[PDB]
Design a binder for this molecule. Structure first.
Ligand SMILES: Cc1cc2nc3c(=O)[nH]c(=O)nc-3n(C[C@H](O)[C@H](O)[C@H](O)COP(=O)(O)OP(=O)(O)OC[C@H]3O[C@@H](n4cnc5c(N)ncnc54)[C@H](O)[C@@H]3O)c2cc1C
Ligand SMILES: Cc1nc2c(=O)[nH]c(=O)nc-2n(C[C@H](O)[C@H](O)[C@H](O)CO)c1C
Ligand code: SF4
Length: 512
C-alpha cells in the first residue's frame, strides 16, 4: 500500500504520482506547511491562491473516490514541513512505498532526496510528464552546441509537438512571426473585461486565515478574483481564446496606465500549478487558428511563449544547477530599493507597475522586464535581491520559471548565458511603449536637470561603468558610438547626475 504525495504546484489528476494507484489501498497526501509558505515572503494573494487551489483539489479527488489526507496550515498537530508531515503519515498509515512527482525547485528536490535515508522506505520519485523535455533530453541537446538560443530549441519543440506544422514545414513557411508586427498603443474601450471568480466558502475561509497568519506579508488581499477550480481555469482559457487571442501579438509590448491586462491571457497562475495544462492551452490556440479565429502571428506568437520560452526556462534552470542564483557578472552589491515594497515613488511607471503588483500580484511581461526589471539593472541592484522580489511578489512565481527570467533575461547577471541580449533602455523606450510619461512629473526628453527621468542618466551611467564587460557586444555598439560623441563635460554631468540619484537610494536603504 502506497503513500502518494502531491505538491502544491502539481494539482492535476494525471500528475506522474497518480499513475497506477489503488483508490482503495493508497492514500493521497496534501499539506499546507510553514516551511513552504515562508522560505520567502510570498504575496498574500499568492499564499491564499495556492492554499485555496489545494483545498479545492482535495475536494476534487475525494469526489473521484480517492483516500485523501489533508493537513491545513493551522491544524493542531501540523508538523511544519514536507519531511515532518510525511513522517506523521508513515506512523499513521505505515505504507510500503512513497510516491511523488519531481518538484520544481532545487531546495525542494534537496528535501525529497533525503526521504529514503531518513525513513528507510522505498521512495519512487517520478519525472513530471507535464514538460516536453526531460532533464536528460535537454542536457543532451545542450551538449554539442556551445551556444544556447531559444530559437533553435523552439524549432525542436514545434517538430516534436506537431503544433502549427504542415507535417515537416512550419505553417506559413516561417517558424517565427516576430512580428506582423508592432505599432503604438490604443486605450481600446471596446475591449472585454478579463474574467474574475468571486471567492467561495473555501476561498473565503482561506483569505481569512492568510490575513491572520501572514499579516506583515507583501500585498493586499482585497478583490481576490483567481480561479481556484479546474472548471474555472478552463473558463479563463476559453474567454482568452474568444476575446483576446486574436489581438495578442498586436498589443504585446504595450503598457497603458489604465489597462493592467490589455490582451494577455492571465493563465500563468493556472498553468504553473496544474489547473491548466500547457499543451492543451496551445492546442486550443491552434484549434482557434484553423477556425479563422485569430491570425497566424497572434497564435504562433502565443504558442512561442509556452512551448518555447517556458519549456526553455525550465531546461535552463536544471541545467545550470543550484548556484546559478549566485551569478553576478556585473559585481553588484546595492540593496533592493525601498519603493519596490511601498510603491511610493515619483517615477510614474514604477509607481503604477509596483502598485499593480501590490494589489493584484500580477504584471505582464514587458512590465516585469522593462519597468521594474530594467530599473534594477541600470541601478545596479544585487541580482539576489531582485530574484527574491520577483519570486515573492507574483502569484505565478516558482524558482524554475522565475530565476532564469530574472538572472538571465532581465539582469544579464550570467553574461548572456541563455542567449539573450541585454534589455537596458532609457525613458525614450517607456515613452514610446506607454502612456506612463504623460502624467509623470519628469520629462523623458531631459537627461540633466531637476525633472529628467532618472532612467536616462542611469542608462548612460550603466553603459559607462560596465563599458569593459560590454564593449564587445554588437548590440550596445551603437549606444557606445553615441556616448563617445558626447563632449567630455556632458559625459561628466550625466554620470554625476546618475550618482546623485544612486545616493538617494542608498540613503534610504540605510534607514531600514
Ligand atoms: C523579470 C521577469 C520575471 C518573471 N517571472 C515569472 C514568473 O515568476 N512566473 C512565470 O510564469 N513567468 C514569469 N515571467 C515571464 C512572463 O513575464 C510571464 O509568463 C507573464 O507575465 C505571465 O503573464 P500571462 O499569463 O498574462 O502571459 P501571456 O503574455 O498571456 O503569455 C502566454 C503564456 O506564455 C507563458 N510565458 C510567457 N512568457 C514567458 C517567459 N518569459 N518564461 C516562461 N513562460 C512564459 C506564460 O505561461 C503565459 O501564461 C517573468 C518574466 C520576467 C521578464
Ligand atoms: C506558498 C506555498 N505553499 C505550499 C504548501 O503549503 N504546500 C505545498 O505543497 N506547496 C506549496 N507551495 C509550492 C511549493 O513551495 C514549491 O514551490 C513547489 O512544490 C515547487 O515544486 C507554495 C509556493
Ligand atoms: S518619464 Fe521616465 S520616469 Fe516618468 S514615467 Fe516616463 S519613464 Fe517613468
Amino acid at each position: 500500500s502506497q503513500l502518494v504525495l502531491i505538491l502544491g504546484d502539481q494539482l492535476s489528476p494525471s500528475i506522474a504520482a497518480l499513475d497506477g494507484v489503488d483508490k482503495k489501498q493508497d492514500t493521497i497526501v496534501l499539506c499546507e506547511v510553514m516551511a513552504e509558505a515562508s522560505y520567502v515572503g510570498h504575496h498574500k494573494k499568492k499564499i491564499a491562491f495556492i492554499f485555496s487551489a489545494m483545498r479545492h483539489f482535495a475536494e476534487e479527488l475525494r469526489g473521484e473516490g480517492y483516500r485523501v489526507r489533508y493537513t491545513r496550515i493551522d491544524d493542531a498537530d501540523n508538523a511544519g514541513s514536507f519531511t515532518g508531515e510525511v513522517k506523521r503519515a508513515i506512523d499513521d498509515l505505515t505504507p510500503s512505498r512513497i510516491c511523488v512527482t519531481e518538484p520544481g525547485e532545487w531546495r525542494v528536490r534537496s528535501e525529497m532526496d533525503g526521504f529514503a535515508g531518513a525513513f528507510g522506505i522505498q521512495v519512487d520519485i517520478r519525472s513530471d510528464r507535464r514538460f516536453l523535455s526531460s532533464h536528460g533530453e535537454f542536457r543532451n541537446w545542450a551538449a554539442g552546441r556551445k551556444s544556447l538560443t531559444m530559437e533553435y530549441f523552439y524549432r525542436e519543440m514545434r517538430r516534436k509537438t506537431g503544433l502549427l506544422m504542415n507535417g515537416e514545414q512550419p505553417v506559413g513557411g516561417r517558424w517565427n512571426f516576430d512580428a506582423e508586427n508592432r505599432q503604438p498603443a490604443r486605450p481600446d474601450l471596446l475591449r472585454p473585461k478579463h474574467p474574475v471568480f468571486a471567492p467561495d466558502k473555501i476561498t473565503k475561509e482561506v483569505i481569512d486565515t492568510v490575513e491572520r497568519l501572514f499579516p506583515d506579508n507583501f500585498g493586499k488581499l482585497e478583490n481576490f478574483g483567481f480561479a481556484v477550480t479546474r472548471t474555472d481555469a478552463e473558463r479563463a482559457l476559453s474567454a482568452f481564446i474568444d476575446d483576446f487571442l486574436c489581438n495578442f501579438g498586436a498589443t504585446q509590448d504595450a503598457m497603458l496606465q489604465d489597462d493592467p491586462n490589455l490582451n494577455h491571457s492571465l493563465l500563468s497562475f493556472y498553468i504553473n500549478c496544474g489547473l491548466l495544462d500547457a499543451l492543451d492551452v496551445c492546442k486550443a490556440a491552434e484549434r482557434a487558428y484553423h477556425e479563422g479565429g485569430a491570425p497566424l502571428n497572434a497564435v504562433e506568437g502565443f504558442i512561442r511563449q509556452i512551448i518555447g520560452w517556458r519549456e526553455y526556462m525550465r531546461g535552463i534552470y536544471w541545467l545550470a544547477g543550484p548556484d546559478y542564483v549566485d551569478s553576478n557578472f556585473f559585481e553588484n552589491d546595492r540593496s533592493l530599493p525601498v519603493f519596490y515594497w511601498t510603491g511610493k515613488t515619483h517615477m510614474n511607471c514604477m509607481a503604477k507597475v509596483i502598485t499593480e503588483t501590490i494589489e493584484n500580484a500580477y504584471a505582464h511581461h514587458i512590465q516585469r522586464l522593462m519597468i521594474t526589471g530594467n530599473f534594477a539593472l541600470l541601478a545596479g541592484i544585487d541580482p539576489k535581491a531582485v530574484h527574491r522580489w520577483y519570486l515573492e511578489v507574483y502569484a505565478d512565481a516558482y524558482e524554475w520559471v522565475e530565476l532564469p527570467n530574472v538572472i538571465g533575461m532581465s539582469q544579464f547577471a550570467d553574461g548572456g548565458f541563455l542567449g539573450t541580449k541585454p534589455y537596458a533602455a532609457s525613458g525614450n523606450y517607456i515613452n514610446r511603449m506607454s502612456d506612463y510619461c504623460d502624467t509623470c512629473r519628469y520629462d523623458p526628453k531631459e537627461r540633466l536637470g531637476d525633472n529628467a527621468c532618472p532612467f536616462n542618466a542611469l542608462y548612460w551611467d550603466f553603459l559607462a561603468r560596465n563599458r569593459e564587460k560590454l564593449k564587445s557586444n554588437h548590440r550596445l555598439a551603437q549606444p557606445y558610438a553615441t556616448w563617445a560623441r558626447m563632449s567630455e563635460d556632458v559625459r561628466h554631468d550625466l554620470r554625476a547626475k546618475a550618482a546623485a540619484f544612486l545616493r538617494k537610494l542608498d540613503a534610504a536603504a540605510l534607514e531600514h
